[PDB]
């Protein structure tokens, strides 16, 4: 039936409905810091989120998305390995049932507690639907979360999770500033890949930040109280909504730092 993260419809089953799963540029991957090549020609990332307009937060089964108004160049990503402007459309997380797992990408096989994905689409294509059909349609900024001290800027997200506990629930979520979720350094690794959930389209330029952000045990705990199921259906905690590392194949991970 519908894909998920359970025993019978998890990541290992996705290929049956989405053949691209066994594709050539699938994500996530393991970042081997000793094999990633420092590329001196990579420009600094340019993150312009000062005019960001969040609109809503919703539980879509699978995860929770904070959506932004992408009708204009309000919140954009440029620079780095990117050509052109990419507008922020939404951000979501992937997390585990325990602090030792949850991230999708791994660094030298190390898994983090969770991973934040800020999804942007190339403005050249007019809309996200067209953008997904292109090799350079999307740019996703990945940030690792480790358990330690609380991240103040993440609390507004944490406090609203109660109202979107089950699949299909949404809540107005205005005036949230995404700049509060950024680490202080913007050093990164980049490689060409895909969406990590079906349809698993190979249209993503991945930008994974080296420096993780810290969140408290209590903050991550609230993520774990969400449900994959809808209201009235039997309860299945939304945990371990991450896809394991895929083979790198013919790809090279470049690093912006030496």
DSSP bridge pairs for 213: 145
Annotated binding-site residue? 120: no
Q: Is 117 in the site for Zn ion (CB under 5 A)?
A: yes
DSSP 188-234: EEEEEE--SSTT--S-EEEEEESS-EEE-HHHHHHHTT-BSSPTTSP
By beta-carbon proximity to Hg ion, the closer residue of 171 and 201 is: 201
By beta-carbon proximity to Hg ion, the closer residue of 64 and 191 is: 191
Distance in Å, CB of 228 to Zn ion, minimum: 15
Q: Which of Zn ion, Hg ion, none interacts with 210 (beta carbon under 5 to 8 A by kind)?
A: none
By beta-carbon proximity to Hg ion, the closer residue of 57 and 203 is: 203
What residue is closest to Hg ion based on CB? 203
Annotated binding-site residue? 92: yes
Using CA atoms, how far residue 74 sits from 85, 89, 90, in Å, is 11, 10, 13
Annotated binding-site residue? 117: yes
Do strands 64-68 and 86-95 pair parallel, antiparallel, or not at all (unpaired)? antiparallel
Q: Which 3-state string (H, E, C) describes 135-152?
A: CCCEEEEEEEEEECCCCH
The rounded distance, in Å, linking the Cα atoms of 158 and 256 is: 32
Give the count of residues interacting with Zn ion (CB under 5 A). 1
What residue is closest to Zn ion based on CB? 117
- Given the rule CB under 5 A, which of 10-18, 30-38, 109-117, 171-179 is the region that contacts Zn ion? 109-117
The rounded distance, in Å, linking the Cα atoms of 56 and 53 is: 10
Largest CA distance in the chain: 55
Annotated binding-site residue? 35: no
Q: Which of Hg ion, Zn ion, none interacts with 117 (beta carbon under 5 to 8 A by kind)?
A: Zn ion
- Given the rule CB under 5 A, which of 26-34, 112-120, 218-226, 249-257 is the region that contacts Zn ion? 112-120
Name the nearest CA neighbour of 196 among 47, 66, 59, 23.
Answer: 23
The rounded distance, in Å, linking the Cα atoms of 89 and 5 is: 24
Annotated binding-site residue? 197: yes
Catalytic residues: 62
Residues that bind Hg ion (CB under 5 A): 201, 203
By beta-carbon proximity to Hg ion, the closer residue of 25 and 151 is: 25
Residue 144 token pair: 């690792």
Q: Is 210 in the site for Zn ion (CB under 5 A)?
A: no
List residues binding Zn ion (CB under 5 A): 117
Annotated binding site: 92, 94, 117, 196-197
Summarize the annotated binding site for Zn(2+) as residue ranges. 92, 94, 117
């Amino acid at each position: 039936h519908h894909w998920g993260y359970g025993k019978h419809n998890g990541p290992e089953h996705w290929h049956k409905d989405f053949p691209i799963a066994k594709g050539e540029r699938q994500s996530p991957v393991d970042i081997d810091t000793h094999t990633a090549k420092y590329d001196p020609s990579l420009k600094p990332l340019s993150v312009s989120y000062d005019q960001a307009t969040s609109l809503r937060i919703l539980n879509n089964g699978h995860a929770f998305n904070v959506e932004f108004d992408d009708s204009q160049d309000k919140a954009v990503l440029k620079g780095g390995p990117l050509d052109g402007t990419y507008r922020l459309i939404q951000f979501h997380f992937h997390w585990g049932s325990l602090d030792g797992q949850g991230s999708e990408h791994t660094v030298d096989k190390k898994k983090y507690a969770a991973e934040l994905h800020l999804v942007h689409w190339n403005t050249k294509y007019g809309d996200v639907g067209k953008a997904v059909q292109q090799p350079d349609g999307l740019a996703v900024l990945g940030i690792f979360l480790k358990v330690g001290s609380a991240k103040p800027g993440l609390q507004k997200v944490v406090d609203v999770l109660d109202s979107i506990k089950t699949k299909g629930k949404s809540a107005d979520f205005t005036n949230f500033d995404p700049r509060g979720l950024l680490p202080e350094s913007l050093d990164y690794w980049t490689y060409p890949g895909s969406l990590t959930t079906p349809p698993l389209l190979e249209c993503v330029t991945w930008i994974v930040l080296k420096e993780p952000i810290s969140v408290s045990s209590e903050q991550v705990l609230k993520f774990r109280k969400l449900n994959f199921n809808g209201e009235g259906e039997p309860e299945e905690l939304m945990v371990d909504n991450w896809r394991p590392a895929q083979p790198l194949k013919n790809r090279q991970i470049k690093a912006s730092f030496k």
